[PDB]
Design a binder for this molecule. Structure first.
Ligand SMILES: CCCC[C@@H](CN[C@@H](CCCC)C(=O)N[C@@H](CCC(N)=O)C(=O)N[C@@H](CCCNC(N)=[NH2+])C(N)=O)NC(=O)[C@@H](NC(=O)[C@@H](NC(C)=O)[C@@H](C)O)[C@@H](C)CC
Lengths: 99, 99
């Protein structure tokens, strides 16, 4: 699709068997989802931006379906205000910014 | 241009006759720049990010060039970690997300 930017670019995702809404965020290095269970081992991480830092769990090799496009990568889980799809998964679905 | 997302989507901007680097950010409603001087009156604004909320100064109708494209619009100034070009100005330069 071509997504204009008049409104927040929200899409439906499927992760861990759950449907969620998430923000396509070219300003995020990483993908960050609100609290949920995921399989495998994890390690703690601190991630920052406006307002400072939050602590998250880092899970590797997680499959995600983003607006119908499957991708695999690292997913961070923690107390984010909004579910965020970052560049690590945007690249995998072929997303580009065009102007 | 077409900007891929394997690296951060950093571009050169010009504001107040000075060149700066900024992040093209689909996950930002607004454009937020690190401390600098801008002309005119400002109004207060609270904005939120991953870590919480910060206060910024809102300046209206500021001339800004983004990657060679001229925009005139609202610029927020405050303690952002990184200069970000948000959707208010991405729409002025005709940017879209495509996959
Ligand atoms: C400043 C740092 C770079 C840009 C920023 C954009 N993220 C978005 C989404 C964050 C969740 C809230 C953002 O802050 N957007 C703000 C920008 C400010 C603005 N006014 O536009 C926004 O739209 N805020 C809205 C509200 C958003 C939430 N709304 C809601 N919950 N209903 C607002 N009007 O205040 N990216 C990040 O915060 C990411 N940080 C990073 O990618 C890097 N960190 C640094 C410090 O560069 C990396 C080294 O970790 C996070 C997510 C970790 C991967």
């Amino acid at each position: 699709p071509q997504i204009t930017l008049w409104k927040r670019p929200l899409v439906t995702i499927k992760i861990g068997g759950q449907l969620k809404e998430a923000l396509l965020n070219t300003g995020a290095d990483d993908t960050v989802i609100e609290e949920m269970s995921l399989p495998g081992r994890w390690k703690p991480k601190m991630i920052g931006g406006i307002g400072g830092f939050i602590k998250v769990r880092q899970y590797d090799q997680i499959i995600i379906e983003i607006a119908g496009h499957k991708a695999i990568g690292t997913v961070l889980v923690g107390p984010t205000p909004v579910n965020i799809i970052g560049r690590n998964l945007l690249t995998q679905i072929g997303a580009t910014l065009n102007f």
